[PDB]
Design an enzyme around this catalytic site. Structure first.
Site, short mmCIF file in Angstrom:
data_model
loop_
_atom_site.label_atom_id
_atom_site.label_comp_id
_atom_site.label_asym_id
_atom_site.label_seq_id
_atom_site.Cartn_x
_atom_site.Cartn_y
_atom_site.Cartn_z
N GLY A 261 0.79 -1.23 0.00
CA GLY A 261 0.00 0.00 0.00
C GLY A 261 0.82 1.28 0.00
N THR A 262 0.13 2.42 -0.03
CA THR A 262 0.78 3.73 -0.04
C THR A 262 1.31 4.06 1.35
OG1 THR A 262 -1.23 5.02 0.46
CG2 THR A 262 -0.77 4.56 -1.86
N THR A 263 2.21 5.04 1.42
CA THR A 263 2.84 5.42 2.69
C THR A 263 1.90 6.28 3.53
OG1 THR A 263 4.97 5.49 1.50
CG2 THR A 263 4.94 6.33 3.77
N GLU B 275 0.18 9.47 1.88
CA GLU B 275 0.46 9.58 0.45
C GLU B 275 -0.74 9.05 -0.34
OE1 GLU B 275 3.99 7.93 -2.49
OE2 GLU B 275 3.19 6.53 -1.01
N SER C 65 -2.65 1.99 5.79
CA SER C 65 -2.05 1.58 4.52
C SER C 65 -2.40 0.13 4.25
CB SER C 65 -0.53 1.74 4.58
OG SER C 65 -0.17 3.10 4.76
#
Ligand SMILES: [Cl-]
Ligand SMILES: [Cl-]
Ligand SMILES: [Mg+2]
Ligand SMILES: [Mg+2]
Ligand SMILES: [Mg+2]
Lengths: 243, 241, 231, 244, 250, 111, 195, 225, 204
Positions: free
Chosen positions: A29-31, A46, A74
Site C-alpha cells: 500500500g501507499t505510505t 500519500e 495503509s
C-alpha cells in the site's frame, strides 16, 4: 506444508502465515505516517494520483473517530474502513455508558481485540491494513500503530506502507534532534516533508498530500484536517527540503 | 495430514497445534521469573524496546487483572491482551456473583479450562501464551499459578518462563535446595525484588539497567507494578553489596 | 493457485484472487462511460445483445430522483447493489428529509462490498458500477469496484476496451468539465468518449443507452429513438 | 474455512452405497456375536462378551443384553456407548407411548422409531452413524412373539431366528439348518448356545463369556416375563445342554 | 465467526476403525499409570504424582478427585481433559439426579452420565474425543462398593481390580495373582502400593503418590452434627503421612 | 395510562366529476379546544395524478401518506415506471391499512 | 433522609439508618451509604432491593472499568447509575445520590431521582424526609465550607428530617471523602436530638 | 418466628415448628432450619416450598463452587447467590431468610427478604412472630454475649413468638455455628407444647366398619415359571 | 372457579405398627353434579402408594407422569423406588411448575423395603413436603379429616385396628362434605402384603 492455506493455523514455527501474508498487502500500500508532538498528534498520508481524472482533495483517506481521534491506514482501503466503522461503534458505546469520550489507550485496545479476533478462526480473513491512529484525551497526546496480527504499541513516531523504511529513518532523526519535543505546527511541516521523502519509493506516479491533526492548543483537542494556507505552507516547506 | 492443522489427535496421540502454540510462546524472546516472599509475591520480566520510535511506557507484558491479582504473559502481545481482557472480565464477574475477590488459583483454573476447550474444539485455536498469575491470597498467602496452551496449570514455589527458562529454573532450584524452604525469607518486598533481579542476573549472565527490566509486586489487598525509578533504586541497592 | 478457492484466503504475496476474479468479470462486461461538468453528470452505456432476435441488456439503473448508476459485469449483482442504494437513498429521505450525498452513497457501497470479501461462505460482487448524482455540493461521478474501492472522478470508463474511452477523457479533461448549462454537449462528449472503445460494431438506436442528472434535471434514462439525436 | 476438514458422512458412493454405513457394518462384524431365536412359546436371546478378563466383575456387568421395557429387550452388537444412547431414547419412546395411549407399545412401532433415528444420521446432519446393530426380542397382543434386527442404515427386518456381529454367515447357516417352526423355547435355548459354541473365535464357550436372556409366557397365566440370566444360571444351562 | 464445524471429526475408516478414539487410547497409553482395587469393605484408587518440575507444588494438582461424598475418580492420559470432566461429572450428579431425587446418584448411574458426555465428544460436531481413561470408585446403599473404568469411546466396564496407562499390562497381571474375593480394605491398599511401585522410576513416598479410598462413613469429616441419618462421606484421600506409614509395612 | 391516539380534528371532502375530481380539506389543526395551526396542509399530491388525505389522528395520517408516496416510488422502480392507476392505488392502500388491523391508523382516508 | 454536600476539601455523604415495612421499623441501624469505588460512594433511597441490586451492578462495572482504564470519574459513576435507572424506570423505585472525590475535579455530587435524570449540584437532598428540610438547607448552605461546618450542616439538617419524618430515624451516618482518605462518622440520638 | 443472634465466637439461629394453611395447622413439627453447607445454615419464613427450593438450589451450587475452588464456602457467597435469585423473580418466590454461618473470614449473620434486599445485624428476626421476638431481643440483647447466653436469648425470642403469635407454635429448633468447630443442629431443642393425655381411647371394635369387597393387591413384579 | 374444589374428593393416610394405611373416596363431580362413583384417587408404583386429591385432570395427568418416571427409574436403577425417594421426586416435579402449578394435594404412603420403616408424606400443590409421623390429610374435607384424625388416632396401631380408625376418619369426614363420598377405598399396607377394602357408605 499446507499451514499457510488456512487462517488461525500455527505452523511448526509457531507462526500464523495468513497474518504474515496480510502484512504483504500492507507493505504493498501507499505510505502513511504519524507524529506525536508536544500537546497532540499529526497524521499524514500519500495518495497516489493514478490518473488526471481523479478529483483533487475529494477521495479523503484519513478518517475521524468520535471527535478527538484520527485514523489513517495503509493496505486494503476497504478493510481500513471496516475497522474504523467498528472503532466508531466502540467509541459510541463507551461514551454512551461512561459519558466521557473514549481514552486513546482504551480505544487502541478496542481495535486491537477486534483485529486479534480475526486471527482466531479460519472462517474469517485477517485485516489487510496497518492502522496509525491517536489523539488527545484527559492524560494528553497518544499515538498508536496497529498491525494485522492485532499487535499495537504507543509511538513517538510511526510509519507504514511501501515507503516505511525511508519514513522511519526520518522519524528517528526528529526524535534524536528534539528530546524536549516538537510543536504541533512544526510536526505538520515535518509530516509533509517525510511523505515527500517517502514518495521516492512510489516515484513513478505523482501524488497528493493529505494531513490532519489533533492538538490541545491548535485545535482544542479535536481532530481537524489541515486545509488551505496551512496545508500549502507545509507543501512549500516540503518541496524546499527535497530540492 | 490435516491432523496437524486443527486440534484433533495424530496417530501418536498428540495435538500438534497445541505443541506449535507452545513454540509461539517464545516468539517475543523475553524471560520472566516469579518468586514468593513472606508477605509478598514478586514477578520480574525482561523489557526490550528495540525501536527508538516506540513509547517505552506502553511496552508491557505485565497486567493488573484485579486489585489483588497480577498476571505476566510469555507470548505475542495480541494473544496476551486477549487473555488479559478475559481474565479481568472473569475476575469482575466472580466478585459480583459470589461476593468475594476471585482467588489467584481459581482464576488460573478458569483460564486453564478455557484453554482446554480450544484444544478440544476445532473452530477455536489455542492462544500462543503462557500466563503466570500472582497474588497474596487471603487464604493461601503468596501464590504463583501458571497456565499454558495445553490447558495445564499448577501452583509454584517459584517459576520461570521464556527461551532461557531452564537456566533460571535450575538457578532457583539450587537456591531452594540450600534454604530448604518454599519461599524467600524476607520481610520487605523491596528485598524480595532485589533477590529476584539478582538471581536472574546470575542465571542469564547479563547486567540490567532500569529500562531493561519490568517488575510487578503483589502484597496483601493490592498488586502494583514498579516504575523505572523504583527499579533503579532496586538496582543501586544490589550494586552496593 | 492454491489460494483462490475462497475469498477468505490471502496469497503469499498478499493478494485476494477471488476478488481479482470478480474484477475480471467486469473486464468481460460491455463498455460504459461516466463524465461530469459542474452543472450536470452523464452516463453513457453500450448495451449488449445475445443475438439478433434478442433485446439489448439494460445497463443503467435509477436509484433516486437525484442519483443513479450504470453497470458492467454480473447484472443480478448490480440489481442487488442498486436495490441497496435505493433503500439507503430512501431511508435518508424518510428519516432525515435529506437527499443522500453521492459521496456517502459510495461509502455505503464500499462497506457492503467489503463484508463479502472478508467472510467465509459468501462471494465478492461480480460487477462494477459508475454512480452519477447531483446533491448539495453539485455534480458527482463515482467508480465502484467490487473489491470495495470507491473513487470520485471527473470522468471514467469501465468494461471491455474501456482504456480507449478513459484516455480520451484524460485528454478532454479541461474541455468537458467546463460544459456548464449545456446537457446536449456534455452527452456528445460522452458519446464521443465511448466511441473510442468500439471495434467492428457502431452505435445504433437500440445499442446506445444514455442517462443524465443535473441542477434542474432529475435522473432520467434515454433509450431507443430518444438517443437517435446523438448517433 | 471449515469445509476443508469435512469428511461428508452422508453421501453416496458412485455405486450407490453409503460409505459410513458400510464401514459401520464392517465395525460391527468384529463385535461379539449375538443370536436371537423365536419359538412358539417364547424368545431366546444369546450373546458373546468380547475377550473378557478374570478380573472383570461379571454379575454387575452389562454390554450385550438390555431391557427396553417389561415386554421388549435388545441384544447389542457394536459400540456399547453408541447403543446406550439409542437404548435410553427407546426407553423414553416406550414410556411416551404408554402415557399417551395407556397401552404398552407394540414391538414394531418401537423398532421403527429407533430405526428412523438411525436413518436420519445417514441422510442429514453431517454426523457419523451409530455403529450399532440391534436384535429386538419382544411381545405384544397383536403379533405375539417377534424378533427384529436393525443396523446403522436404519433398515429393519423381522426374523424367526437371526444373528448379528461376528461370524453371522456361519451362524445363519447353522440356524437355517436346525431351526423348525414348531420349535419350543427349551429347544431354542439349546440351538442358540450350540450355534455360538461353533462360531466362537474363542477356544471354548464358558459362562463368563456369555450373556443370556429369555422372554417367556412361562409367567403365571396370560402375561409375559423377561429373564436376564445370572452368571450362575448361564453356567447351569451350559451344563444342561451339554456344552461344558 | 460461529462454530462452523457442525460435522463429525471422528468417522469410520474402511476397516471399521474410529481413528480418533484409537488415537485417544494411544494418548491414554502414554499417560502415567493409575489403578483401582475393590475390597469387601471398600475400594482403593491410586496413581503417581508425576511432578513436571521440583519448583511446582504437586499438592495443588489433584489427580484423585471427589465427585460425590461416596464417589471418587482417578485417570490416565491428558490432565486438562480430566479436570473439565470432573467439573462436568460433579455438576451432572446434581442437575440430573440430586436436584430430582434429593440424594446422590449411585456409582453406576454417575458413571453412565460421564460415559454419555465422553460418547458425545466422539460423535458431536467439531470436537475430538476426550484423551483420558477414568477409574471411578464408589459406594451406594443398594449396589454396595463398585469400581468402573470409562474409556474415550464412552464404553464403561465394572472391575474387581484393574490398571490403566503406562504399565497397565504388567500391573493387571500383578493384580490377577494377588486379588481375591476376601480382601479387606487395608490388604487392597497394600496391594495397590506394591503394584504401583513397579511402574514408578524415581521417588516412591507419600509426596509422590496420590491415593484415596471409598470405605467407612467419616462423621468427623461431615462438618456438622444433629442429623442421625447423615453419617459423613465414604470418600477419603489418604495423607502423605498415612501413605508413608504403610510404606514401612511394605 | 398512555393513550397512543389523539384527535387533530379537520374535515375533508372528495367529489368525482365526469372528467375531473376534487379533494378538499380545511387547513386547521387542533387538540381539544386549542388551535395548533391555522395552515397545516392535509391534502397531498402523491404523484401519478393521485391526491390523498388521511383525516383524523394527524400522526397516523402523515405516516400513511408518507408510506403510500413511498409505495408509488417503488411501484415505478419495480414495474418499469408504469403509472399507478387509481384503482390499483386504492387496493394498495387497503393493504397498508389492514396491515395494522390490530393497531390501526386512526384515520378516514380519501383519494 | 439522605444528603451529599460538597465543601472545600471534598465531599461528605450523610444518611439516617431507618428501614421500614409500613410503620414497622425492619432495621434501625441500616447503612444507606454504600461504596461503589474507593472514593465514589452513593446514598440510597426508595426500594432497598432495587437500590442494592443497582449499587452491586455499578460496583461491578466500575471494578471492571478500573481494571481496563484506571480510576473512573464521579461523572462516569453517575452515568452508570443513570443508565440503569433510566432504562429500567418502569420496574425500579430508586432515588440515588452519587458523591465522589477526584484530585482533578475535587468533590462532586450528582443526584438521580425516580425518572432516571441526572443533576450535578453543590449539594443534594433526597428521601421522604428531605421534604421537611428544603427550606433549612437552602438557607444554611454555603459553598466552600470547612469540614467541621459541613458536618454540622448535615447533622443539623438530617436531625430535623428525622424529627418530622416517621420513615427516617436511628443514627446519622456520614462518610467524608477527601484527598486524605475515607472517614466514617456516626452520630447517635442523644447527640443530634438536643440540637 | 425465626431469629438469629451473634455471639463471642460465632452465631446461633432458631425457629419455631408450626406450618399453617390459613387458620389450620398443616404440620406441628415442621423443620424451618435448612442446611446450605456444613457450616452455613439458614432459617426460612413465608412460602414453605420456596424457602426449601431456593435453599436447596443455592446449597447445590455452593457445594459445586466449593469443589471448584477447593475452598470452604462463604456466607457472603450464599447471601449473594440467594439475593440475586430472589431479586430476579421480583418477590414472587416468597422466601424470607435469615442466613448465618462460619467460614475462613469469620462468623456472619444476615437477613434476606423475598424482593432481594439484605441486611446485616448482631440480632435479627423474621416472620409473623418477628415483632414478639424482636421485642425480646431489644430488651435482653447486649454486646459480647457468650454461646450459652445467645442460645438462651434466641430460644426466648422464639418462645415469645410461639406463645403470642398464632402463626407460630409447637417447638423450638436451634443451630449453633461456632468458629473452629462443627455446627451443632439442635432439632427440638425445646418441647413446651406436648399434648396432654386424652380422656378416652377411640380404638374401635374390629368389624365396626361395613365392607363390600376385599382383594389382594399385586405389588410384586411379574413372576417366573 | 376454585380448581381444587370443582371435582371434590379426599385422601387420608396413617401409620401403624409395621404398617401404613391410605384411603380415599370415590366421588368425581362437576360442582353440584355427581358424575362418577368409581374415580379412585390412590395409585401405586411398585410398593410405593400415591393418593392425589384436587382437580381430576391433574390427578390423572400426574399419575401417568409418575408411572412414566418410576418406570424409567426402575430400568436404570435396577430396583423399585422407595417412599423417601419418591417423595423427593414428587416435590421436584411439582415445584418445576411453580408459577403454573398442578392443582392437587398429593399423599405418599409406603414402607421402605430395606429398613422396614413405615412412611407417609403430604404436599401442597407446589411441592412443600409435610413428613408427619402420625397422619396426613388432603382434599375438600381436610378440616374434617384433621379433626377426626387428631381425636381418633393413636400411635402403634395393629393393621386390623388401623383399618377401623382410618375408615371411620374418612367416612365421618366425607359425610360432612358435600363434594366427598359416593364410596370409599382403604389400602392396608404391610412389608409384603397389601389388602384393599371397599367401604359401604351413604350414597348422597
Ligand atoms: Cl470453567
Ligand atoms: Cl439497605
Ligand atoms: Mg482448535
Ligand atoms: Mg423519626
Ligand atoms: Mg357427602
Amino acid at each position: 506444508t499446507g499451514y499457510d492455506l488456512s487462517n488461525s493455523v500455527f505452523s511448526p514455527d509457531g507462526r500464523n502465515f495468513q497474518v504474515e501474508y496480510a502484512v504483504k498487502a500492507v507493505e504493498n500500500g501507499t505510505t502513511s505516517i504519524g507524529i506525536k508532538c508536544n500537546d497532540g498528534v499529526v497524521f499524514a498520508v500519500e495518495k497516489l494520483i493514478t490518473s488526471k481524472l481523479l478529483v483533487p482533495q475529494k477521495n479523503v483517506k484519513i478518517q475521524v473517530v468520535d471527535r478527538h481521534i484520527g485514523c489513517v491506514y495503509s493496505g486494503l482501503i476497504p478493510d481500513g474502513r471496516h475497522l474504523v466503522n467498528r472503532g466508531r461503534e466502540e467509541a459510541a458505546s463507551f461514551k454512551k455508558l461512561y459519558k466521557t469520550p473514549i481514552p486513546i489507550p482504551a480505544f487502541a485496545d478496542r481495535l486491537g481485540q477486534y483485529v486479534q479476533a480475526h486471527t482466531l478462526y479460519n472462517s474469517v480473513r485477517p485485516f489487510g491494513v496497518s492502522t496509525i491512529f491517536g489523539g488527545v484525551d484527559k492524560n494528553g497526546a497518544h499515538l498508536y500503530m496497529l498491525e494485522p496480527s492485532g499487535s499495537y504499541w504507543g509511538y513517538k513516531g510511526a510509519a507504514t506502507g511501501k515507503g516505511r523504511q525511508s519514513a522511519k529513518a526520518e522519524l528517528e532523526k526528529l526524535v534524536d534532534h528534539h528530546p524536549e519535543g516538537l510543536s504541533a505546527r512544526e510536526a505538520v511541516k515535518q509530516a509533509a516533508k517525510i511523505i515527500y521523502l517517502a514518495h521516492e519509493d512510489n516515484k513513478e506516479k505523482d501524488f497528493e498530500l493529505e494531513i490532519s491533526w489533533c492538538s490541545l492548543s491548535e485545535t482544542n483537542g479535536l481532530h481537524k484536517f489541515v486545509k488551505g494556507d496551512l496545508l500549502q505552507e507545509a507543501i512549500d516547506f516540503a518541496q524546499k527540503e527535497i530540492n | 495430514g490435516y491432523d496437524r492443522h486443527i486440534t484433533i489427535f495424530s496417530p501418536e496421540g498428540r495435538l500438534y497445534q497445541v505443541e506449535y502454540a507452545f513454540k509461539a510462546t517464545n516468539q517475543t524472546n523475553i524471560n520472566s521469573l516469579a518468586v514468593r516472599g513472606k508477605d509478598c509475591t514478586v514477578v520480574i520480566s525482561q523489557k526490550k524496546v528495540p525501536d527508538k520510535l516506540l513509547d517505552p511506557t506502553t511496552v508491557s507484558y505485565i497486567f493488573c487483572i484485579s486489585r489483588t491479582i497480577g498476571m505476566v504473559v510469555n507470548g505475542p502481545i495480541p494473544d496476551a491482551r486477549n487473555a488479559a481482557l478475559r481474565a479481568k472480565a472473569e475476575a469482575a464477574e466472580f466478585r459480583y456473583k459470589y461476593g468475594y475477590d476471585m482467588p489467584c488459583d481459581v482464576l488460573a483454573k478458569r483460564m486453564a479450562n478455557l484453554s482446554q476447550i480450544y484444544t478440544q474444539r476445532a473452530y477455536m485455536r489455542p492462544l500462543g501464551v503462557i500466563l503466570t498469575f500472582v497474588s497474596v491470597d487471603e487464604e493461601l498467602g503468596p501464590s504463583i499459578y501458571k497456565t499454558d496452551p495445553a490447558g495445564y496449570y499448577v501452583g509454584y514455589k517459584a517459576t520461570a518462563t521464556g527461551p532461557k527458562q531452564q537456566e533460571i529454573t535450575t538457578n532457583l532450584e539450587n537456591h531452594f535446595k540450600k534454604s530448604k524452604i518454599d519461599h524467600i525469607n524476607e520481610e520487605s518486598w523491596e528485598k524480595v525484588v532485589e533477590f529476584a533481579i539478582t538471581h536472574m542476573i546470575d542465571a542469564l549472565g547479563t547486567e540490567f539497567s532500569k529500562n531493561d527490566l519490568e517488575v510487578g509486586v503483589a502484597t496483601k489487598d493490592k498488586f502494583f507494578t514498579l516504575s523505572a525509578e523504583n527499579i533503579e533504586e532496586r538496582l543501586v541497592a544490589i550494586a552496593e553489596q | 493457485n492454491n489460494y483462490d478457492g475462497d475469498t477468505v484466503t490471502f496469497s503469499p504475496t498478499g493478494r485476494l484472487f477471488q476478488v481479482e476474479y470478480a474484477l475480471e468479470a467486469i473486464k468481460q462486461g460491455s463498455v460504459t462511460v461516466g463524465l461530469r461538468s459542474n452543472t450536470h453528470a452523464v452516463l453513457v452505456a453500450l448495451k449488449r445483445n445475445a443475438d439478433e432476435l434478442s433485446s439489448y441488456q439494460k445497463k443503467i439503473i435509477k436509484c433516486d430522483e437525484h442519483m443513479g448508476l450504470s453497470l458492467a459485469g454480473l447484472a443480478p449483482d448490480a440489481r442487488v447493489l442498486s436495490n441497496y442504494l435505493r433503500q439507503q437513498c430512501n431511508y435518508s429521505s424518510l428519516v432525515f428529509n435529506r437527499k443522500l450525498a453521492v459521496e456517502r452513497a459510495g461509502h455505503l457501497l464500499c462497506d457492503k462490498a467489503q463484508k463479502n470479501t472478508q467472510s467465509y461462505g459468501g462471494r465478492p460482487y461480480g460487477v462494477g458500477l459508475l454512480i452519477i448524482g447531483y446533491d448539495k455540493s453539485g455534480a458527482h461521478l463515482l467508480e465502484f469496484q467490487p473489491s470495495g474501492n470507491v473513487t470520485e472522478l471527473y470522468g471514467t470508463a469501465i468494461g471491455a476496451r474501456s482504456q480507449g474511452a478513459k484516455t480520451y477523457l484524460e485528454r478532454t479533461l479541461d474541455t468537458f468539465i467546463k460544459i456548464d448549462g449545456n446537457p446536449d454537449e456534455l452527452i456528445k462528449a460522452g458519446v464521443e468518449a465511448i466511441s473510442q472503445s468500439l471495434r467492428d460494431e457502431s452505435l445504433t438506436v437500440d445499442n446506445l443507452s444514455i442517462a443524465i442528472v443535473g441542477k434542474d434535471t432529475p435522473f432520467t434514462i434515454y433509450d431507443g429513438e430518444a438517443v437517435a439525436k446523438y448517433i | 474455512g471449515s469445509r476443508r476438514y469435512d469428511s461428508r458422512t452422508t453421501i453416496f458412493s458412485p455405486e450407490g452405497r453409503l460409505y459410513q454405513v458400510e464401514y459401520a457394518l464392517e465395525s460391527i462384524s468384529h463385535a461379539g456375536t449375538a443370536i436371537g431365536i423365536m419359538a412358539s412359546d417364547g424368545i431366546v436371546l444369546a450373546a458373546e462378551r468380547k475377550v473378557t478378563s478374570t478380573l472383570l466383575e461379571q454379575d454387575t456387568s452389562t454390554e450385550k443384553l438390555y431391557k427396553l421395557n417389561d415386554k421388549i429387550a435388545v441384544a447389542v452388537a457394536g459400540l456399547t456407548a453408541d447403543a446406550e444412547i439409542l437404548i435410553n431414547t427407546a426407553r423414553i419412546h416406550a414410556q411416551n407411548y404408554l402415557k399417551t395411549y395407556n397401552e404398552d407399545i407394540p414391538v414394531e412401532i418401537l423398532v421403527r422409531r429407533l430405526s428412523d433415528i438411525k436413518q436420519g444420521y445417514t441422510q442429514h446432519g453431517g454426523l457419523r452413524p451409530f455403529g450399532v446393530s440391534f436384535i429386538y426380542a419382544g411381545y405384544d397382543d397383536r403379533y405375539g412373539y417377534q424378533l427384529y434386527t436393525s443396523n446403522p442404515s436404519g433398515n429393519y427386518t423381522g426374523w424367526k431366528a437371526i444373528s448379528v456381529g461376528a461370524n453371522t454367515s456361519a451362524a445363519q447357516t447353522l440356524l437355517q439348518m436346525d431351526y423348525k417352526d414348531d420349535m419350543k423355547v427349551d429347544d431354542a435355548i439349546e440351538l442358540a448356545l450350540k450355534t455360538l459354541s461353533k462360531t466362537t473365535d474363542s477356544s471354548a464357550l464358558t459362562y463368563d463369556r456369555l450373556e443370556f436372556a429369555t422372554i417367556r409366557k412361562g409367567a403365571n397365566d396370560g402375561e409375559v416375563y423377561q429373564k436376564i440370566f445370572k452368571p450362575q444360571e448361564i453356567k447351569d444351562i451350559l451344563v444342561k445342554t451339554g456344552i461344558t | 465467526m460461529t462454530d462452523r464445524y457442525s460435522f463429525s471429526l471422528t468417522t469410520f475408516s474402511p476397516s471399521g476403525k474410529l481413528g480418533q478414539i484409537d488415537y485417544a487410547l494411544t494418548a491414554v497409553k502414554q499417560g502415567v499409570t493409575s489403578l483401582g482395587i475393590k475390597a469387601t469393605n471398600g475400594v482403593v484408587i491410586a496413581t503417581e504424582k508425576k511432578s513436571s518440575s521440583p519448583l511446582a507444588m504437586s499438592e495443588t494438582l489433584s489427580k484423585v478427585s471427589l465427585l460425590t461424598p461416596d464417589i471418587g475418580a482417578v485417570y490416565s492420559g491428558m490432565g486438562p481433559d480430566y479436570r473439565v470432566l470432573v467439573d462436568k461429572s460433579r455438576k451432572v450428579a446434581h442437575t440430573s439426579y440430586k436436584r430430582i431425587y434429593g440424594e446422590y446418584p449411585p456409582t453406576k448411574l454417575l458413571v453412565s452420565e460421564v460415559a454419555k458426555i465422553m460418547q458425545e465428544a466422539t460423535q458431536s460436531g467439531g470436537v475430538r474425543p476426550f484423551g483420558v481413561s477414568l477409574l471411578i470408585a464408589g459406594h451406594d446403599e443398594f449396589n454396595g462398593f463398585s469400581l468402573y473404568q470409562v474409556d474415550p469411546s464412552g464404553s464403561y466396564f465394572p472391575w474387581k481390580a484393574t490398571a490403566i496407562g503406562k504399565g497397565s499390562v504388567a500391573a493387571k497381571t500383578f493384580l490377577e495373582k494377588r486379588w481375591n474375593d476376601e480382601l479387606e480394605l487395608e490388604d487392597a491398599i497394600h496391594i495397590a502400593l506394591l503394584t504401583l511401585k513397579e511402574s514408578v522410576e524415581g521417588e516412591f513416598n507419600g509426596d509422590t503418590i496420590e491415593l484415596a479410598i471409598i470405605g467407612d462413613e467419616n462423621p468427623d469429616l461431615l462438618g456438622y452434627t444433629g442429623i442421625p441419618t447423615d453419617k459423613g462421606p465414604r470418600f477419603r484421600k489418604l495423607t502423605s503421612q498415612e501413605i508413608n506409614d504403610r510404606l514401612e509395612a511394605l | 395510562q398512555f393513550n397512543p391516539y389523539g384527535d387533530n380534528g379537520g374535515t375533508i371532502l372528495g367529489i368525482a366529476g365526469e372528467d375531473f375530481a376534487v379533494l378538499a380539506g380545511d387547513t386547521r389543526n387542533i387538540t381539544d379546544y386549542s388551535i395548533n395551526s391555522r395552515y397545516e396542509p392535509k391534502v397531498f399530491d402523491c404523484g401519478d395524478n393521485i391526491v390523498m388525505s388521511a383525516n383524523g389522528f394527524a400522526a397516523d395520517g402523515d405516516a400513511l401518506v408518507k408510506r403510500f408516496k413511498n409505495s408509488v416510488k417503488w411501484y415505478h422502480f419495480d414495474h418499469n415506471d408504469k403509472k399507478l392507476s387509481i384503482n390499483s392505488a386504492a387496493r394498495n392502500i387497503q393493504h397498508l391499512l389492514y396491515g395494522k388491523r390490530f393497531f390501526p391508523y386512526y384515520v378516514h382516508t380519501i383519494i | 433522609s439522605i444528603m451529599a454536600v460538597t465543601f472545600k476539601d471534598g465531599v461528605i455523604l450523610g444518611a439516617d439508618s431507618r428501614t421500614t415495612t409500613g410503620a414497622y421499623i425492619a432495621n434501625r441501624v441500616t447503612d444507606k451509604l454504600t461504596r461503589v469505588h474507593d472514593k465514589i460512594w452513593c446514598c440510597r433511597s426508595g426500594s432497598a432491593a432495587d437500590t442494592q441490586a443497582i449499587a452491586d451492578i455499578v460496583q461491578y462495572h466500575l471494578e471492571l472499568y478500573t481494571s481496563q482504564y484506571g480510576t473512573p470519574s464521579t461523572e462516569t459513576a453517575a452515568s452508570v447509575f443513570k443508565e440503569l435507572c433510566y432504562e429500567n424506570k418502569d420496574n425500579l423505585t430508586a432515588g440515588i445520590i452519587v458523591a465522589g472525590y477526584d484530585d482533578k475535579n475535587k468533590g462532586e455530587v450528582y443526584t438521580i431521582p425516580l425518572g432516571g435524570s441526572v443533576h450535578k449540584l453543590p449539594y443534594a437532598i433526597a428521601g421522604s424526609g428531605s421534604t421537611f428540610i428544603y427550606g433549612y438547607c437552602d438557607k444554611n448552605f454555603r459553598e466552600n465550607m470547612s469540614k467541621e461546618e459541613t458536618v454540622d450542616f448535615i447533622k443539623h439538617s438530617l436531625s430535623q428530617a428525622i424529627k418530622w419524618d416517621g420513615s427516617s430515624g436511628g443514627v446519622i451516618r456520614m462518610v467524608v471523602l477527601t484527598a486524605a482518605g475515607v472517614e466514617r462518622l456516626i452520630f447517635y440520638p442523644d447527640e443530634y436530638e438536643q440540637l | 418466628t425465626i431469629v438469629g443472634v451473634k455471639f463471642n465466637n460465632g452465631v446461633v439461629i432458631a425457629a419455631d415448628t408450626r406450618s399453617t394453611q390459613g387458620p389450620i395447622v398443616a404440620d406441628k413439627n415442621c423443620a424451618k432450619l435448612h442446611r446450605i453447607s456444613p457450616k452455613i445454615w439458614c432459617a426460612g419464613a413465608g412460602t414453605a416450598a420456596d424457602t426449601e427450593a431456593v435453599t436447596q438450589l443455592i446449597g447445590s451450587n455452593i457445594e459445586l463452587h466449593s469443589l471448584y475452588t477447593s475452598r470452604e464456602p462463604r456466607v457472603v457467597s450464599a447471601l449473594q447467590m440467594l439475593k440475586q435469585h430472589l431479586f430476579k423473580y421480583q418477590g414472587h418466590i416468597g422466601a424470607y431468610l435469615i442466613v448465618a454461618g462460619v467460614d475462613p473470614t469469620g462468623s456472619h449473620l444476615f437477613s434476606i427478604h423475598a424482593h432481594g434486599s439484605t441486611d446485616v445485624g448482631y440480632y435479627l428476626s423474621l416472620g409473623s412472630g418477628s415483632l414478639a421476638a424482636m421485642a425480646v431481643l431489644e430488651s435482653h440483647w447486649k454486646q459480647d454475649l457468650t454461646k450459652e447466653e445467645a442460645i438462651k436469648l434466641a430460644s426466648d425470642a422464639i418462645q415469645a413468638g410461639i406463645w403470642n403469635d398464632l402463626g407460630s407454635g409447637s417447638n423450638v429448633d436451634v443451630c449453633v455455628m461456632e468458629i473452629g468447630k462443627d455446627a451443632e443442629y439442635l432439632r427440638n431443642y425445646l418441647t413446651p407444647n406436648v399434648r396432654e393425655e386424652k380422656q378416652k381411647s377411640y380404638k374401635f371394635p374390629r368389624g365396626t366398619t361395613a365392607v363390600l369387597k376385599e382383594s389382594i393387591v399385586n405389588i410384586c413384579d411379574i413372576q417366573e415359571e | 372457579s376454585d380448581p381444587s374444589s370443582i371435582n371434590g374428593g379426599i385422601v387420608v393416610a396413617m401409620t401403624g405398627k409395621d404398617c401404613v394405611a391410605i384411603a380415599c373416596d370415590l366421588r368425581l363431580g362437576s360442582q353440584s353434579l355427581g358424575v362418577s362413583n368409581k374415580f379412585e384417587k390412590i395409585f401405586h408404583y411398585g410398593h410405593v402408594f400415591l393418593g392425589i386429591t384436587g382437580l381430576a385432570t391433574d390427578v390423572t395427568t400426574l399419575n401417568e407422569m409418575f408411572r412414566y418416571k418410576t418406570n424409567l427409574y426402575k430400568l436404570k436403577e435396577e430396583r423399585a423406588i422407595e417412599p423417601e425417594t419418591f417423595t423427593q421426586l414428587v416435590s421436584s416435579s411439582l415445584y418445576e411448575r411453580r408459577f403454573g402449578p398442578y392443582f392437587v394435594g398429593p399423599v405418599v404412603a409406603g414402607i421402605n423395603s430395606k429398613s422396614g420403616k413405615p412412611f407417609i408424606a403430604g404436599f401442597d400443590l407446589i411441592g412443600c413436603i409435610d413428613e408427619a409421623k402420625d397422619f396426613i390429610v388432603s382434599g375438600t374435607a381436610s378440616d374434617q379429616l384433621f379433626g377426626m384424625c387428631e381425636s381418633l388416632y393413636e400411635p402403634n396401631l395393629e393393621p386390623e385396628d388401623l383399618f377401623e380408625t382410618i375408615s371411620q376418619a374418612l367416612l365421618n369426614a366425607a359425610d360432612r362434605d358435600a363434594l366427598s363420598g359416593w364410596g370409599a377405598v382403604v389400602y392396608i399396607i404391610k412389608k409384603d402384603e397389601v389388602v384393599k377394602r371397599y367401604l359401604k357408605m351413604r350414597q348422597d
